[PDB]
Point group: C7
Chain length 29, copies 7
């Protein structure tokens, strides 16, 4: 469904943010 | 659908945030 | 619809956050 | 509707976050 | 409804984040 | 319901984020 | 359901963010 697909896009974007957030954590260490 | 379209706008905004977040990670490195 | 309108409000708020996030990236760069 | 109202509260909280994020950007400049 | 109640929990958690975010802004100014 | 339960999981994850965010505010102080 | 599964993916992604956020807090102290 289009609604479920859009919700999965939201999750994918958040995993993108999490990847960057882990890079920042490594950067500070 | 209007609901699915709006949910896709939410994902698009989060991708904007992820792009800026990657820029911040690069700056710290 | 009211639900779609509220979801677009969520998207716009995230676009506000993205603007500020870019401002932080510029400040750090 | 109750669901639409709750979604608007999510949007309002995100606008609170955006305001604070702009304050952080000001601090960094 | 259970769905509306859960969405209000989401909004409240975001309001918690906003409070902490304001605390961070205050610290960076102070 | 499974949808309400999943929404509560989203809320719980955000409360985890808020906890860490408060720890960061304390760290800066 | 597909919608509930997708919402659970969102929740898990936020838990990924929470873990990374805790690592940042630790880094600022350690």
């Amino acid at each position: 469904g289009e609604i479920a697909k859009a919700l999965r896009e939201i999750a994918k974007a958040l995993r993108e943010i999490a990847w960057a957030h882990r890079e920042i954590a490594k950067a500070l260490r």
